[PDB]
Design a binder for this molecule. Sequence first.
Ligand code: DOA
Length: 13
Amino acid sequence: ALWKTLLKKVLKA
Ligand SMILES: *C(=O)CCCCCCCCCCCN
């Protein structure tokens, strides 16, 4: 619900 785009590579950022 809009999270995979939060750790797209920034390891949760
Ligand atoms: C999409 O969101 C799939 C995984 C769930 C992550 C969100 C947790 C719910 C609590 C509020 C934080 C913002 N969605």
